[PDB]
Amino acid sequence: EVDISHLDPRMQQIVEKQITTAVKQYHAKSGVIAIADPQTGNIIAFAESSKNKGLESWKSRIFSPGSTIKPFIAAAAINSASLADAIAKSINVCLIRVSQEAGVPVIRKKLTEFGFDMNSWWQADQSDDLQLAMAALGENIPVTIESLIKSYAILANKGHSFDRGNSAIISETSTNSINHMLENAVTNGTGKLAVIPGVSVAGKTGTVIENNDKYLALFAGYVPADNPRYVLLVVIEEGYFSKNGKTLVSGGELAAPVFRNVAMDALS
């Protein structure tokens, strides 16, 4: 379960109002928002709202990160129709190719260093390329809200990992590129609804299909991009919103605007 000691009452109240409103507005099964401090990775706010009973809390719930893994795949490849475009538009085939060309040792080691479990959901006699494909899709990787936001905290912390005595996980060059890609993913990609005029926002959308037709809509990011103050992760479960005929269900459509509202509140 998520650590609850470093909580900030001002941040907590913000996310409490926002997630509860979003879950109702999206007719969602559940939803969660977490905020973390870029310097330490500590959770400073965590709130969830669920419409019905029996749900496991997002404090402990295990899920797949989906395309929110993509920045780390790119980071690993860079550190060892452009890549920036593929991150911005979230192009699966391209990131998969990037992962497969980087190779199993590079991807498994570097993603492990980012705080990802590259061991649990991994088969010994399964094709390396198939599993690198799954990695790029964030399909064979168990995360929690806590572990995922801590991984993003590393990127917000200039590619340094607090938990490893502030060691550089990726180079400065790599960090600059990745941050640029995440800013571009927001201003000119699937994360467009997270745009805040005058404030650079870095973030990545995700949309995960669970069993049958169960959607997780995700958005992970940090703000301001140039000198992060907050790391945020928003996850909506089985939410949807109708704009005329369109039924919107994706991370960019659901989770990103929620990220935006919390971010604007946090920056006062």
Chain breaks in the chain (C to N over 2.5 A) after: 80
Q: How far is CA 130 from CA 69, 78, 188, in A?
A: 16, 21, 30
Phi, psi for 96 (deg, rounded to 5): -65, -45
Angle at Cα 158 formed by Cα 157 and Cα 163, nearest 5°? 45
What is the DSSP pairing of strand 202-209 with strand 167-168? unpaired
| DSSP symbols for the chain | ----TT--HHHHHHHHHHHHHHHHHTT-SEEEEEEE-TTT--EEEEEEEESSSSPPPTTT--B--GGGGHHHHHHHHHH---HHHHHHHT-HHHHHHHHHHH-HHHHHHHHHHTT---STT--SSS-HHHHHHHHHHT-S--B-HHHHHHHHHHHHTTTEEGGGTSEESS-HHHHHHHHHHHHHHHHSSTTGGG-BTTB--EEEEEEEE-STT-EEEEEEEEESTTS-SEEEEEEEES--EEETTEEE-SHHHHHHHHHHHHHHHHT-
Look up the domain containing 137 and give its range.
1-268
Measure the CA–CA gap between 163 and 41, rounded to whole angstroms. 8
92-102 and 128-137 helices, crossing angle to 10°: 130
Pairwise CA distance, residues 199 & 13, whole Å:
22
Experimental method: X-ray
CA 106 to chain centre: 21
Token pair in block for residue 63: 């899920």
Measured distance CA(110)–CA(155) in Å, rounded: 13
Number of structural domains (the chain) is: 1
Cβ distance 71 to 189 under 8 Å?
A: no
CATH for 264: 3.40.710.10
Number of Cα atoms under 13 Å in the Cβ half of residue 255 = 33
**HSE-up (13 A, CA, CB side) for residue 197:** 0
Amino acid 73 reads I
Distance CA 206, CA 86 (A): 14
